[PDB]
Amino acid sequence: FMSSRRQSVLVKSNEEGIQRVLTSDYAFLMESTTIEFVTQRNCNLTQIGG
Amino acid sequence: CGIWVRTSNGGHFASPNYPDSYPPNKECIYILEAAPRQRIELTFDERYYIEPSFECRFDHLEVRDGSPLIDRYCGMKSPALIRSTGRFMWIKFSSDEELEGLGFRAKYSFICQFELSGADGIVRSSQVEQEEKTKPGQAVDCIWTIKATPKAKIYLRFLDYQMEHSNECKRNFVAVYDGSSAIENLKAKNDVMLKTGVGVIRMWADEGSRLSRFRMLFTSFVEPPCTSSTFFCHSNMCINNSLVCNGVQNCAYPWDENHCKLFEQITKTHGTIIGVTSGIVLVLLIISILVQVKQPR
């Protein structure tokens, strides 16, 4: 899916991906530790799955 | 660093700090540009008459006609005179990190390219039947010159690209050149980012204009990290002079020209009208019933 989209839904950093999630139904898979940090600093976006 | 000498029958050309030693870590490109049927005389006065000292591959001086590179000299010799018939002499001087010396002096004398610059625009594909109407039969090729707003590196995006004449390019290809328009550095022959501020687009075609299209867009103010006023379309892509919502995909991802774009009761395309008419008829009928009603006492 990402290969077909090929920058249609892709990101080159973290913060811009965070904002893209904040502005659209965006997944932005990330390593768990920073996800914990972000979802604790903010309170509107939380991790799903395991 | 470049010393342009356009439209002068004579003038002078020499290394930076010419009586002194050349500064290191230069990379300066030079041009002798002449009118058709205007022939160029290029001359080296030696400041230092000897057979060349450091004959090697750093600190070379290239010479470019049209780009078949005529030669590269180094050390401490003069090339003999070379007579110009291509009338567009391209001179590149390079400097290393740690070999610094007497420099050089020169004397020049006189004996399908279109302009396309600004902040934004599109190179019309196969746009040759208006600029330089070339018959389709022969191989055709043209170059395109971009110039950004002061202090602006450029980003390009191809909107339509199909060179069906052949997969291979020994006949037909499209390439991009960075820096100034020389054979010095092919940026590429996907979208592209120009490192410099002046753009060079050449296209080669053969046996017809059947090439489907080369239709692409160049962007300005692509260079700076954001000060503030222009929008953060992408990382250090604050560009706006007026292109905020210009109706064209003017950024790598949709940002600048995207995301900015009582009758609700009657918003039915035809339904509202038919229903309303039937309703008026009914209301009037209700009023008729009401008149007959206020009639009995």
Curated annotation (Swiss-Prot), chain A:
Top-level taxon of the source organism: Eukaryota
Tissue-by-tissue expression: Highest expression is found in the olfactory lobe, piriform cortex, dentate gyrus, hippocampus, granular cell layer of the cerebellum, and in caudate-putamen.
Source organism phylogeny: Eukaryota, Metazoa, Chordata, Craniata, Vertebrata
More about this protein: The postsynaptic actions of Glu are mediated by a variety of receptors that are named according to their selective agonists. This receptor binds domoate > kainate > quisqualate > glutamate. It does not bind AMPA without coexpression with GRIK5.
Protein name in UniProt: Glutamate receptor ionotropic, kainate 2
Residues reported in the UniProt entry to bind L-glutamate: E31
Post-translational modification: Sumoylation mediates kainate receptor-mediated endocytosis and regulates synaptic transmission. Sumoylation is enhanced by PIAS3 and desumoylated by SENP1. Ubiquitinated. Ubiquitination regulates the GRIK2 levels at the synapse by leading kainate receptor degradation through proteasome.
Its job: Ionotropic glutamate receptor that functions as a cation-permeable ligand-gated ion channel, gated by L-glutamate and the glutamatergic agonist kainic acid. L-glutamate acts as an excitatory neurotransmitter at many synapses in the central nervous system. Binding of the excitatory neurotransmitter L-glutamate induces a conformation change, leading to the opening of the cation channel, and thereby converts the chemical signal to an electrical impulse. The receptor then desensitizes rapidly and enters a transient inactive state, characterized by the presence of bound agonist.
Protein family: Belongs to the glutamate-gated ion channel (TC 1.A.10.1) family. GRIK2 subfamily.
UniProtKB/Swiss-Prot annotation, chain B:
Protein name: Neuropilin and tolloid-like protein 2
Domain LDL-receptor class A: 225-261
Shown residues within the full chain: 45 to 374 of 525
Record carries keyword Transmembrane helix: yes
Tissue expression per record: Brain (at protein level).
Membrane topology classification: Single-pass type I membrane protein
Glycosylation sites: N240
Gene field: Neto2
All residue ranges annotated as the CUB domain in the record: 1-111, 112-221
Key words of the record: Disulfide bond, Glycoprotein, Membrane, Phosphoprotein, Receptor, Repeat, Signal, Transmembrane, Transmembrane helix
Subunit structure, interactors included: Interacts with GRIK2 and GRIK3, but neither with AMPA-nor with NMDA-sensitive glutamate receptors.
Membrane spanning stretches: 271-291
An example Gene Ontology molecular-function term: ionotropic glutamate receptor binding
Gene Ontology terms describing biological process: neurotransmitter receptor localization to postsynaptic specialization membrane; regulation of neurotransmitter receptor localization to postsynaptic specialization membrane
Keyword match Membrane: yes
Principal location listed in the UniProt entry: membrane
Record PTM: N-glycosylated.
Cellular component per GO, a single term: postsynaptic density membrane
Residue intervals on the Extracellular side: 1-270
Cysteine pairings via disulfide bonds: C1-C28, C56-C74, C112-C142, C226-C238, C233-C251, C245-C260
Protein localization: Membrane
UniProt function note: Accessory subunit of neuronal kainate-sensitive glutamate receptors, GRIK2 and GRIK3. Increases kainate-receptor channel activity, slowing the decay kinetics of the receptors, without affecting their expression at the cell surface, and increasing the open probability of the receptor channels. Modulates the agonist sensitivity of kainate receptors. Slows the decay of kainate receptor-mediated excitatory postsynaptic currents (EPSCs), thus directly influencing synaptic transmission.
